[PDB]
């Protein structure tokens, strides 16, 4: 019951090409997601060095906090709300109960949406 279609690079291109543009550019920039791309790097570098097949309760604690920080950021921003509901990130964060393998697929799918975000439009240098 995942949103990832086992390719996740075509799917990460089917999201950024469908984002609602404005008169000039996209309504979503990458400076609005810096607080969420900094918390997802701490989950990647912690779950990678773990040898177990299920998450530690100290590692499972900071997935609930990333789940709450996504809801708060999507609540006070219109462009982040239309981006979270398009990719399917808040429904996927409730699928990671304690699986290390389903947490690593989220971090691969997260940075395929950032790579095409820098590429598909200017004003990202």
């Amino acid at each position: 019951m995942s949103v990832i279609q086992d390719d996740y690079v075509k799917q990460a291109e089917q999201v950024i090409r469908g984002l609602p543009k404005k008169n000039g550019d996209f309504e979503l920039t990458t400076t609005q997601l810096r607080v969420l791309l900094s918390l997802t790097a701490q989950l990647f570098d912690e779950a990678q060095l773990s040898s177990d097949q299920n998450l530690s309760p100290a590692l499972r604690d900071k997935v609930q906090y990333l789940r709450v920080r996504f809801v708060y950021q999507a609540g006070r921003e219109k462009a982040v709300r239309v981006f979270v509901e398009r990719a399917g990130l808040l429904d996927e964060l409730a699928q990671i109960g304690d699986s290390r393998d389903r947490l690593l697929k989220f971090c691969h799918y997260m940075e395929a949406l950032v790579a095409y975000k820098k590429f598909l439009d200017p004003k990202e240098t």
Partner: protein, 235 residues
């Protein structure tokens, strides 16, 4: 000079009207206002960065040196020769002779003893539409008055970057008093101006106290450390 020295200027920066150095982002994460302030990641105290204090003093001195010579300086490589040897540029004086430092709030327990429930207030402002007479409310956060930060600033006496067209030379005893007169003048313009944002509407008035120079490394002359403290006494 015929020596090497490092002079350290210490003092106290106090807050008269409410101060807001904004952060934009930066993880407050629980019901925070739309305009937060810059804090510390570990001690969670309000702080004043060194970029806000260096960049505000440099533009106030380029306005004074620029208007007194009828020349508008449009970039920091076009500034006066007394500004670029103190703050630095990327063509001739590669590194500045001044090192600014970040400051944190010191008198937290003094403010809690006098009855402060929070270290920052939330101010409700309100823009009024001129046609429908409606209300566009907003919430702003700023450091409360009476807060006190520890001020520190280092000065260096060496050769610098003596490029291949010139020979190397220490600064004389007339160039060091000429530099400390520009420091004391530039800190007196900040007291007749603001620090941070929203300053034309009343924010960010500061004041300097107990400025004093001290030779931390090396040897100065006998009648030089009392001439540098005579310049800092006019602030």
């Amino acid at each position: 000079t015929t020596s090497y020295a490092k002079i350290e200027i210490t003092g106290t920066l106090t807050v008269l009207t409410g101060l807001q150095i904004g952060a934009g982002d930066g993880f407050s994460a629980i019901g925070a206002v739309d305009k937060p302030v810059v804090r510390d990641p570990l001690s969670r105290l309000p702080m004043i960065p060194g970029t806000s204090l260096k960049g505000k003093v440099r533009t106030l001195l380029s306005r004074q040196y620029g208007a007194d010579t009828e020349t508008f300086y449009r970039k920091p490589n076009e500034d006066h020769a007394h500004i670029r040897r103190l703050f630095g540029d990327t063509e001739e004086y590669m590194t500045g002779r001044l090192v600014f430092r970040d400051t944190k709030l010191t008198n937290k327990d003094d403010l809690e003893a006098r009855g402060a429930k929070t270290l920052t207030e939330v101010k409700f402002e309100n823009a009024i539409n001129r046609v429908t007479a409606k209300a566009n409310l907003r919430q702003m956060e700023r450091v409360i008055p009476g807060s006190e930060f520890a001020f520190s600033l280092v000065y260096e006496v060496s050769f610098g970057t003596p490029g291949e067209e010139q020979k190397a030379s220490l600064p004389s005893s007339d160039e060091i008093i000429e530099d400390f007169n520009a420091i004391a003048r530039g800190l007196k313009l900040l007291e007749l101006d603001y620090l941070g944002g929203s300053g034309t509407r009343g924010y960010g008035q500061v004041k300097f106290s107990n400025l004093k120079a001290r030779a931390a490394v090396g040897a100065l002359d006998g009648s030089l450390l009392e001439k540098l403290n005579h310049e800092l006494a006019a602030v």
